[PDB]
Design an enzyme around this catalytic site. Structure first.
Site, PDB file in Angstrom:
ATOM      1  N   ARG A 173       0.828  -3.769   5.203  1.00  8.13           N
ATOM      2  CA  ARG A 173       0.869  -3.253   6.575  1.00  8.13           C
ATOM      3  C   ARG A 173       1.031  -4.436   7.521  1.00  8.13           C
ATOM      4  NH1 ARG A 173       0.723   0.363   3.283  1.00  8.13           N
ATOM      5  NH2 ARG A 173      -0.865   2.027   3.195  1.00  8.13           N
TER       6      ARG A 173
ATOM      7  N   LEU B 109       7.290   3.907  -9.527  1.00  4.81           N
ATOM      8  CA  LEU B 109       8.712   4.175  -9.298  1.00  4.81           C
ATOM      9  C   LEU B 109       8.921   5.421  -8.449  1.00  4.81           C
ATOM     10  CD1 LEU B 109       9.368   3.665 -13.069  1.00  4.81           C
ATOM     11  CD2 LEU B 109       9.995   1.990 -11.300  1.00  4.81           C
TER      12      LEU B 109
ATOM     13  N   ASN C 105      -0.965   8.519 -12.688  1.00  3.26           N
ATOM     14  CA  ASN C 105       0.156   9.348 -12.243  1.00  3.26           C
ATOM     15  C   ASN C 105      -0.274  10.744 -11.784  1.00  3.26           C
ATOM     16  OD1 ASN C 105       2.580   7.821 -12.159  1.00  3.26           O
ATOM     17  ND2 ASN C 105       2.681   7.821 -14.403  1.00  3.26           N
TER      18      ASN C 105
ATOM     19  N   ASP D 105       1.522  15.763   1.863  1.00  2.00           N
ATOM     20  CA  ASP D 105       1.133  14.561   2.581  1.00  2.00           C
ATOM     21  C   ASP D 105       1.039  13.395   1.627  1.00  2.00           C
ATOM     22  OD1 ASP D 105      -1.809  13.201   4.196  1.00  2.00           O
ATOM     23  OD2 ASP D 105       0.314  12.808   4.583  1.00  2.00           O
TER      24      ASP D 105
ATOM     25  N   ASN E 139      -0.227  -3.305  -0.931  1.00  2.00           N
ATOM     26  CA  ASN E 139      -0.435  -2.231   0.043  1.00  2.00           C
ATOM     27  C   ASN E 139      -0.145  -2.713   1.470  1.00  2.00           C
ATOM     28  OD1 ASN E 139      -1.474   0.645   0.347  1.00  2.00           O
ATOM     29  ND2 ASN E 139      -2.919  -0.428   1.707  1.00  2.00           N
TER      30      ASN E 139
ATOM     31  N   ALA F  57      -5.224 -12.241  -9.832  1.00  2.00           N
ATOM     32  CA  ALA F  57      -5.671 -10.959 -10.390  1.00  2.00           C
ATOM     33  C   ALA F  57      -5.408 -10.763 -11.886  1.00  2.00           C
ATOM     34  CB  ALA F  57      -5.074  -9.806  -9.592  1.00  2.00           C
TER      35      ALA F  57
ATOM     36  N   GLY G 109      -1.865   7.902   1.319  1.00  2.00           N
ATOM     37  CA  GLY G 109      -2.891   7.427   0.410  1.00  2.00           C
ATOM     38  C   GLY G 109      -2.644   7.780  -1.047  1.00  2.00           C
ATOM     39  N   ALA G 110      -1.443   8.280  -1.334  1.00  2.00           N
ATOM     40  CA  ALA G 110      -1.055   8.641  -2.695  1.00  2.00           C
ATOM     41  C   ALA G 110      -1.163   7.446  -3.638  1.00  2.00           C
ATOM     42  CB  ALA G 110       0.364   9.205  -2.717  1.00  2.00           C
ATOM     43  N   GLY G 111      -0.622   6.306  -3.212  1.00  2.00           N
ATOM     44  CA  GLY G 111      -0.750   5.073  -3.969  1.00  2.00           C
ATOM     45  C   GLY G 111      -2.192   4.669  -4.251  1.00  2.00           C
ATOM     46  N   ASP G 112      -3.102   4.999  -3.343  1.00  2.00           N
ATOM     47  CA  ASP G 112      -4.506   4.669  -3.527  1.00  2.00           C
ATOM     48  C   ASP G 112      -5.124   5.549  -4.616  1.00  2.00           C
ATOM     49  OD1 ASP G 112      -4.110   2.877  -1.430  1.00  2.00           O
ATOM     50  OD2 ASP G 112      -4.824   4.294   0.082  1.00  2.00           O
TER      51      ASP G 112
ATOM     52  N   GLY H 158      -4.536  14.094   4.704  1.00  2.00           N
ATOM     53  CA  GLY H 158      -5.694  13.235   4.560  1.00  2.00           C
ATOM     54  C   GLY H 158      -5.695  12.543   3.212  1.00  2.00           C
TER      55      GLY H 158
ATOM     56  N   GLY I 172       7.825   7.814 -12.223  1.00  2.00           N
ATOM     57  CA  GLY I 172       6.537   7.447 -12.786  1.00  2.00           C
ATOM     58  C   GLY I 172       6.115   6.017 -12.479  1.00  2.00           C
TER      59      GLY I 172
HETATM   60  O1  LIG Z   1      -2.874   3.797   1.904  1.00  2.00           O
HETATM   61  C1  LIG Z   1      -3.362   4.587   2.925  1.00  2.00           C
HETATM   62  C2  LIG Z   1      -4.218   3.816   3.875  1.00  2.00           C
HETATM   63  O2  LIG Z   1      -3.598   2.636   4.310  1.00  2.00           O
HETATM   64  C3  LIG Z   1      -3.850   2.512   5.690  1.00  2.00           C
HETATM   65  O3  LIG Z   1      -2.669   2.580   6.410  1.00  2.00           O
HETATM   66  C4  LIG Z   1      -4.463   1.183   6.005  1.00  2.00           C
HETATM   67  O4  LIG Z   1      -5.601   0.950   5.255  1.00  2.00           O
HETATM   68  C5  LIG Z   1      -4.796   3.610   6.052  1.00  2.00           C
HETATM   69  O5  LIG Z   1      -4.643   4.047   7.343  1.00  2.00           O
HETATM   70  C6  LIG Z   1      -4.436   4.648   5.083  1.00  2.00           C
HETATM   71  O6  LIG Z   1      -5.438   5.564   4.885  1.00  2.00           O
HETATM   72 NA    NA Z   2      -3.249  13.211   0.982  1.00  2.00          NA
END
Ligand SMILES: OC[C@H]1O[C@](O)(CO)[C@@H](O)[C@@H]1O
Ligand code: NA
Ligand SMILES: OC[C@H]1O[C@](O)(CO)[C@@H](O)[C@@H]1O
Ligand code: NA
Lengths: 308, 308
Positions: free
Chosen positions: B161, B220, B281, B245, B159, B182, B248-251, B292, B224
């Site tokens: 940044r 992907l 998925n 939006d 993830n 992990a 945070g889709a990956g989350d 959001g 998927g």
């Molecule tokens: O993956 C989404 C999240 O990743 C971030 O950029 C850092 O934690 C958040 O601002 C966002 O909500």
């Molecule tokens: Na969202």
């Protein structure tokens, strides 16, 4: 046909201000940037020097200031530190309404090489956030010394925001050191008391008598402004306004005052000073009619119509 | 009737997201906080440990997480550093859409004493922002070592940044060190390539073969997710969604995956893993329907109806 340049310096900030319900208006702000726009809206000649972040907020602040006809030739982009970002709580006012999200922000890294060449008769206006940390503190003091040396004039407004200081024990003495350097000083009634360890205004001005300040203005909120010149004081008051947003009202006050002194034949003239404080009161009232420090900063057409 | 605790740790952040015209929605966010809510919405048992700032944003994040039934017993308030604050640019997606306004934020000061007692069979999930600077980096590594020692399991998602890192030259090795620790790892197709100095996915997985990771999931986007277990891989794909939006889709993907593994008799079972990636998925698709990161995180009723 007089009009001197007024340099403003310090923090330009993006003010996040509650609106929708859980929305924020994105408003241009930052006290010395507020004054710079204020002067320009009155057809003044203002110029900003200092550091913002190399980020979108910084660029938004740059474009904002040049859109407002404020000279940004000496506005630098710091390569590492973020632009100041403040959350406003409308339930409070003044200092108590701000939450500073970036400490230290780009402006606190103002360096000596960021100071532009000052000329005789020009003005310099400064707030205490510029004195909060190094290298900005010592940079700002050096610029004040250079303006006095060249034959220009110094305006200072404490405009206190304590949480910015990494060493808050140093606020009182550092702020009072700058008071000792200015030709013009403006306090709120609260800041003056707080800063001189006194109660009442009369005792406040006592503590600074030895400074021989040419002009001290103490804003009384409701009752206008007290104007203290050597061996004389009087209250100057105008019309009142139920405020929608008090944010940056004090800066608009400072705007009008400095616009008028800057276009004067002789700013020390008492009629001139009294008139200036009359413009300053009108500006401060009008500035509170819309959210955002800069939104309702009046042009001359608006101001005269309000004062008449 | 199985359900193990899943610990999430790292950055909780307030996401400023463009709306009105020059307005910002104030949205709860922060990747590990997103996953914590995701698990809870599915009736999971999630718990967050880490540091936010002692400011309104921090309290907003606290209240948000407990409102969402995520255990915040071990969520601490740092006495000096600010809560993470991010500006979103909707014209971009993933990493490139974020501007981090607070560096270093309170979470980067996660200390050893903030780690709670781990038990056998519990899960721990981690992102790379937690490894960006000290003392959080070394604190986070210690917590991973302690979870493995006790007989629990480790989930990691790069993830990435990059601008958060004070020493960005250290990202690659530090992130890959955690990959090596992990039981479960999830990359985006881009991050995997980037992190293994390879092109294509097949060469990517090659570079990490020596790690004997029990489960690697490579998302992907359109096609998927690729599911790599020892000596086998296959693509698991579901229905598609024109996203409003992507934030945070990956989350949300990670949310579903960890909810299902956490309630499993045996998470290593292939039918179990395949099912989990099917929930993951669906979650990732549904999460993109409202602005959001947390807004559209689905409950089980929503998810099943979407998958059927
Ligand atoms: O993956 C989404 C999240 O990743 C971030 O950029 C850092 O934690 C958040 O601002 C966002 O909500
Ligand atoms: Na969202
Ligand atoms: O005086 C108003 C200004 O003062 C500040 O709090 C700090 O500079 C700004 O956020 C605001 O616009
Ligand atoms: Na205003």
């Amino acid at each position: 046909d007089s009009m001197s340049r007024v340099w403003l310096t310090g923090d330009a900030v993006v003010d996040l201000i509650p609106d929708g319900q859980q929305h924020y208006l994105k408003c241009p702000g930052g006290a010395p940037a507020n004054v710079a726009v204020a002067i320009a809206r009155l057809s003044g000649r203002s110029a900003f020097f200092g550091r913002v972040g190399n980020d979108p907020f910084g660029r938004f602040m740059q474009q904002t200031l040049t859109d407002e006809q404020v000279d940004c030739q000496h506005l630098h982009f710091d390569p590492v530190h973020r632009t100041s970002t403040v959350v406003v709580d409308l339930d409070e006012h003044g200092e108590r309404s701000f939450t500073f999200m970036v400490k230290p922000s780009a402006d606190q890294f103002l360096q000596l090489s960021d100071i532009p060449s000052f000329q005789k008769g020009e003005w310099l206006h400064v707030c205490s956030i510029a004195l909060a940390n190094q290298p900005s503190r010592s940079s700002t003091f050096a610029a004040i010394a250079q303006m006095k040396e060249v034959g220009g004039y110094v305006s200072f407004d404490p405009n206190l925001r304590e949480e910015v200081w990494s060493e808050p024990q140093e606020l009182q003495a550092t702020v009072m050191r700058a008071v000792g350097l200015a030709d013009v000083v403006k306090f709120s009634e609260e800041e003056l008391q707080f800063l001189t360890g006194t109660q009442s205004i009369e005792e406040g001005l006592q503590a600074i008598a030895d400074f021989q300040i040419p002009l001290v203005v103490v804003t009384l909120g409701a009752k206008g402004a007290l104007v203290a010149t050597p061996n004389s004081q009087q209250i100057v008051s105008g019309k009142a306004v139920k405020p929608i947003d008090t944010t940056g009202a004090g800066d608009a006050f400072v705007g009008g005052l400095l616009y008028r002194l800057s276009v004067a034949q002789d700013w020390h003239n008492q009629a001139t000073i009294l008139d200036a404080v009359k413009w300053a009161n009108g500006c401060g009232a009008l500035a509170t009619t819309q959210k955002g420090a800069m939104t309702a900063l009046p042009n001359q057409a608006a101001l005269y119509a309000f004062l008449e």
